[PDB]
Scaffold this active site. Structure first.
Site, mmCIF file in Angstrom:
data_model
loop_
_atom_site.group_PDB
_atom_site.id
_atom_site.type_symbol
_atom_site.label_atom_id
_atom_site.label_comp_id
_atom_site.label_asym_id
_atom_site.label_seq_id
_atom_site.Cartn_x
_atom_site.Cartn_y
_atom_site.Cartn_z
ATOM 1 N N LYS A 13 0.812 -1.216 0.000
ATOM 2 C CA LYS A 13 0.000 0.000 0.000
ATOM 3 C C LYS A 13 0.844 1.263 0.000
ATOM 4 O O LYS A 13 0.586 2.180 -0.784
ATOM 5 C CB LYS A 13 -0.966 -0.009 1.191
ATOM 6 C CG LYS A 13 -1.882 -1.241 1.188
ATOM 7 C CD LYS A 13 -2.875 -1.261 2.357
ATOM 8 C CE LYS A 13 -2.210 -1.169 3.737
ATOM 9 N NZ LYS A 13 -1.240 -2.282 4.032
ATOM 10 N N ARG A 85 -8.614 1.360 10.084
ATOM 11 C CA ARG A 85 -8.291 -0.041 10.360
ATOM 12 C C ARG A 85 -9.338 -0.710 11.231
ATOM 13 O O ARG A 85 -9.196 -1.883 11.568
ATOM 14 C CB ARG A 85 -6.945 -0.153 11.066
ATOM 15 C CG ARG A 85 -5.781 0.331 10.280
ATOM 16 C CD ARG A 85 -5.328 -0.674 9.269
ATOM 17 N NE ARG A 85 -4.191 -1.465 9.750
ATOM 18 C CZ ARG A 85 -2.916 -1.073 9.725
ATOM 19 N NH1 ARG A 85 -2.579 0.138 9.275
ATOM 20 N NH2 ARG A 85 -1.971 -1.903 10.174
ATOM 21 N N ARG A 124 11.499 -6.507 4.305
ATOM 22 C CA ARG A 124 11.410 -5.057 4.181
ATOM 23 C C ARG A 124 12.557 -4.375 4.919
ATOM 24 O O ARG A 124 12.889 -4.755 6.047
ATOM 25 C CB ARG A 124 10.069 -4.546 4.716
ATOM 26 C CG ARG A 124 9.927 -3.026 4.661
ATOM 27 C CD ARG A 124 8.477 -2.598 4.775
ATOM 28 N NE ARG A 124 7.871 -2.969 6.060
ATOM 29 C CZ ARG A 124 6.591 -2.745 6.351
ATOM 30 N NH1 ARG A 124 5.811 -2.138 5.464
ATOM 31 N NH2 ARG A 124 6.092 -3.112 7.526
ATOM 32 N N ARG A 150 12.527 -2.597 10.533
ATOM 33 C CA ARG A 150 11.563 -2.137 11.526
ATOM 34 C C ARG A 150 11.357 -3.171 12.630
ATOM 35 O O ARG A 150 11.365 -4.381 12.382
ATOM 36 C CB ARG A 150 10.227 -1.812 10.875
ATOM 37 C CG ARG A 150 10.239 -0.507 10.083
ATOM 38 C CD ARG A 150 9.043 -0.378 9.173
ATOM 39 N NE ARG A 150 7.794 -0.722 9.849
ATOM 40 C CZ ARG A 150 6.582 -0.649 9.302
ATOM 41 N NH1 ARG A 150 6.414 -0.231 8.047
ATOM 42 N NH2 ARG A 150 5.519 -0.993 10.020
ATOM 43 N N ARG A 161 0.251 -8.993 13.657
ATOM 44 C CA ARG A 161 -0.306 -7.976 12.776
ATOM 45 C C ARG A 161 -1.310 -8.569 11.786
ATOM 46 O O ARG A 161 -2.330 -7.940 11.475
ATOM 47 C CB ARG A 161 0.826 -7.253 12.042
ATOM 48 C CG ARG A 161 1.629 -6.357 12.994
ATOM 49 C CD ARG A 161 2.931 -5.924 12.375
ATOM 50 N NE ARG A 161 2.715 -4.932 11.329
ATOM 51 C CZ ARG A 161 3.641 -4.561 10.454
ATOM 52 N NH1 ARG A 161 4.848 -5.110 10.482
ATOM 53 N NH2 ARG A 161 3.357 -3.633 9.552
HETATM 54 N N1 ADP Z 1 -5.238 3.204 11.463
HETATM 55 C C1 ADP Z 1 -4.531 2.644 12.476
HETATM 56 N N2 ADP Z 1 -5.125 2.277 13.633
HETATM 57 C C2 ADP Z 1 -4.442 1.710 14.655
HETATM 58 N N3 ADP Z 1 -3.117 1.471 14.625
HETATM 59 C C3 ADP Z 1 -2.402 1.799 13.526
HETATM 60 C C4 ADP Z 1 -3.080 2.409 12.372
HETATM 61 N N4 ADP Z 1 -2.140 2.628 11.438
HETATM 62 C C5 ADP Z 1 -0.961 2.188 11.939
HETATM 63 N N5 ADP Z 1 -1.122 1.686 13.179
HETATM 64 C C6 ADP Z 1 -0.049 1.142 14.040
HETATM 65 O O1 ADP Z 1 1.173 1.222 13.318
HETATM 66 C C7 ADP Z 1 1.631 -0.096 12.981
HETATM 67 C C8 ADP Z 1 2.236 -0.065 11.594
HETATM 68 O O2 ADP Z 1 1.348 0.673 10.752
HETATM 69 P P1 ADP Z 1 0.984 0.062 9.316
HETATM 70 O O3 ADP Z 1 -0.211 0.772 8.711
HETATM 71 O O4 ADP Z 1 0.980 -1.434 9.505
HETATM 72 O O5 ADP Z 1 2.318 0.586 8.602
HETATM 73 P P2 ADP Z 1 3.223 -0.437 7.772
HETATM 74 O O6 ADP Z 1 2.236 -1.251 6.960
HETATM 75 O O7 ADP Z 1 4.119 0.419 6.909
HETATM 76 O O8 ADP Z 1 3.864 -1.247 8.858
HETATM 77 C C9 ADP Z 1 0.375 -0.946 13.079
HETATM 78 O O9 ADP Z 1 0.625 -2.352 13.228
HETATM 79 C C10 ADP Z 1 -0.293 -0.327 14.286
HETATM 80 O O10 ADP Z 1 0.418 -0.632 15.493
HETATM 81 N N1 ADP Z 2 4.223 -5.745 -5.654
HETATM 82 C C1 ADP Z 2 5.284 -6.031 -4.860
HETATM 83 N N2 ADP Z 2 6.047 -7.127 -5.045
HETATM 84 C C2 ADP Z 2 7.102 -7.409 -4.249
HETATM 85 N N3 ADP Z 2 7.474 -6.644 -3.205
HETATM 86 C C3 ADP Z 2 6.787 -5.518 -2.930
HETATM 87 C C4 ADP Z 2 5.626 -5.143 -3.737
HETATM 88 N N4 ADP Z 2 5.146 -3.986 -3.240
HETATM 89 C C5 ADP Z 2 5.925 -3.660 -2.168
HETATM 90 N N5 ADP Z 2 6.909 -4.574 -2.005
HETATM 91 C C6 ADP Z 2 7.922 -4.629 -0.933
HETATM 92 O O1 ADP Z 2 7.200 -5.267 0.128
HETATM 93 C C7 ADP Z 2 7.386 -4.568 1.375
HETATM 94 C C8 ADP Z 2 6.046 -3.994 1.822
HETATM 95 O O2 ADP Z 2 5.628 -2.906 0.976
HETATM 96 P P1 ADP Z 2 4.876 -1.654 1.649
HETATM 97 O O3 ADP Z 2 4.590 -0.712 0.511
HETATM 98 O O4 ADP Z 2 5.686 -1.157 2.817
HETATM 99 O O5 ADP Z 2 3.531 -2.382 2.162
HETATM 100 P P2 ADP Z 2 2.372 -1.805 3.141
HETATM 101 O O6 ADP Z 2 2.487 -0.304 3.113
HETATM 102 O O7 ADP Z 2 1.085 -2.371 2.576
HETATM 103 O O8 ADP Z 2 2.775 -2.382 4.478
HETATM 104 C C9 ADP Z 2 8.435 -3.511 1.115
HETATM 105 O O9 ADP Z 2 9.693 -4.085 1.486
HETATM 106 C C10 ADP Z 2 8.395 -3.295 -0.396
HETATM 107 O O10 ADP Z 2 9.691 -2.992 -0.903
#
Ligand code: ADP
Ligand code: ADP
Length: 203
Positions: A13, A85, A124, A150, A161
């Site tokens: 995303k 979420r 990642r 991370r 998660r």
């Molecule tokens: N809309 C939301 N509501 C509650 N917690 C959130 C939300 N967005 C992010 N978080 C917190 O941040 C963490 C990582 O955010 P996330 O959207 O999963 O970012 P990423 O996908 O890049 O890890 C989540 O597992 C949660 O702990």
């Molecule tokens: N279509 C794809 N195919 C393979 N790897 C991807 C793709 N899109 C993102 N990634 C990789 O996967 C991981 C998660 O992407 P991210 O954009 O952070 O996901 P989200 O925001 O949904 O958590 C990152 O390490 C990114 O480089």
């Protein structure tokens, strides 16, 4: 145009949102990115959110709703990435949009199996300096670029998660289906292919 990107962690995303924002002109709101910044700056929000984030739990709704109100644009093109979420968050978003004379135009569901997103999350890596996102297999950092993993991309936290996503966030799929604005993206494909689907949905 107001977009919501919905789907499991690691679906891609953020990656899609950053490219769409730059190429087609959207403000990108990532609750994950903003929360991580809060933790790094040790704000009251950060200090409270840290414990949930590191364990893979959702941060409490009232904190998230405030976060979004703080960064809400007046109007125009916006991508909500990782928000809402929960159903309470989605109700709150509808209220915020209403008071700005706006509404959600499309909810894009990034459909992708757990085995796919586990590899994506486990590999990642982030450049802590530029914030750029890499993947040790799918998009490795260039020579000389220092990256970190991370804290919540560790195996047991990824598991939590995904459980949390299935429990609290997945019900939003039918919440938005009822409203007739849900569109399914096949997020298991490479980045370019997922992007072309996104552009096809939003025109
Ligand atoms: N809309 C939301 N509501 C509650 N917690 C959130 C939300 N967005 C992010 N978080 C917190 O941040 C963490 C990582 O955010 P996330 O959207 O999963 O970012 P990423 O996908 O890049 O890890 C989540 O597992 C949660 O702990
Ligand atoms: N279509 C794809 N195919 C393979 N790897 C991807 C793709 N899109 C993102 N990634 C990789 O996967 C991981 C998660 O992407 P991210 O954009 O952070 O996901 P989200 O925001 O949904 O958590 C990152 O390490 C990114 O480089």
């Amino acid at each position: 145009m107001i977009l919501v990107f919905l789907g499991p962690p690691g679906a891609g995303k953020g990656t899609q949102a950053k490219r769409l924002a730059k190429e087609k002109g959207f403000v990108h709101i990532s609750t994950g990115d903003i929360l991580r910044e809060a933790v790094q700056k040790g704000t009251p929000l950060g200090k409270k959110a840290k414990e949930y984030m590191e364990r893979g739990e959702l941060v409490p709704d009232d904190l998230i709703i405030a976060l979004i109100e703080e960064v809400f644009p007046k109007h125009g093109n916006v991508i909500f990435d990782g928000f809402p979420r929960t159903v309470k968050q989605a109700e709150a978003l509808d209220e915020m949009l209403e008071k700005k004379g706006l509404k959600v135009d499309h909810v894009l569901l990034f459909e992708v199996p757990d085995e796919v997103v586990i590899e994506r999350l486990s590999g990642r890596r982030i450049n802590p300096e530029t914030g750029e996102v890499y993947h040790v297999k799918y998009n490795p950092p260039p020579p000389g670029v220092k990256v970190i993993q991370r804290e919540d991309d560790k195996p047991e936290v990824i598991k939590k998660r995904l459980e949390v996503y299935r429990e609290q966030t997945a019900p939003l799929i039918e919440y938005y289906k009822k409203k007739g604005i849900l569109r399914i993206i096949d997020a298991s494909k490479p980045v370019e292919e997922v992007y072309r689907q996104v552009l096809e949905v939003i025109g």
